[PDB]
């Protein structure tokens, strides 16, 4: 009904620094820095005092209000990622064929290399995204951890991993081989 003004609050801890011209957002903290463009959104920003940033929408509808809330959520994710970080643990399973997971540096591009998935000679290559670090978890069988500050890049890379090793033309009730996300969380 054209709400005259709607507001959302964004809390900033002490170590974090937030810089916002028109709708570009830069967030700097211990773990690094992050940037995001929100010029598609048509909202208004303002600051109260070094710990509280308000986002406002004037004379808008349901979709505009939803955009306000999701903007708040995105900035909160940026702050959490620059402060603590995001860590996704994935486990790869097999019944007969041991899946061999390695890393290769090809033209300085950091590809993840999967071999012998369900007994195939094809070599599945997944490009690692910038701001993502892979390590093979020690003392835990067949687990790989993706760490970073961009939840988007981390989760999308994990999704690429679990999608590239999909099973084709076989009953999944029987064939359980694959790579699956075991855990999501912080560092």
């Amino acid at each position: 009904m054209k709400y005259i003004q709607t507001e959302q609050q964004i809390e900033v801890p002490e170590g974090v620094t937030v810089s916002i011209k028109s709708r570009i957002v830069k967030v700097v903290g211990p773990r690094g820095t992050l940037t995001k463009n929100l010029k598609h959104i048509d909202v208004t920003f303002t600051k109260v005092n070094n710990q509280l940033i308000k986002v406002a929408v004037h004379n808008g509808g349901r979709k505009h209000v939803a955009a306000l809330r999701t903007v708040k959520s995105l900035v909160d994710n940026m702050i959490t990622g620059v402060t603590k970080g995001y860590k996704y643990k994935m486990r790869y399973v097999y019944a007969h064929f041991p899946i061999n997971v390695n890393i290769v540096e090809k033209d300085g591009a950091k590809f993840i290399e999967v071999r012998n998935f369900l007994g195939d000679k094809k070599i599945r290559n997944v490009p690692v995204r910038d701001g993502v670090t892979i390590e093979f978890s020690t003392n835990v069988k067949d687990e790989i951890v993706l760490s970073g500050n961009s939840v988007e890049d981390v989760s999308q890379n994990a999704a690429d991993l679990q999608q590239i090793c999909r099973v084709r033309n076989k009953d999944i009730r029987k064939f359980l081989d694959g790579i699956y996300v075991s855990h999501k969380g912080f560092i």
């Binding site: 900033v12 620094t17 937030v18 810089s19 920003f45 070094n50 940033i53």
Partner: peptide
């Protein structure tokens, strides 16, 4: 110089 520099847009 590590404070937030959010704009105003009067």
């Amino acid at each position: 110089s590590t404070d937030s520099i959010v704009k105003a847009s009067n």
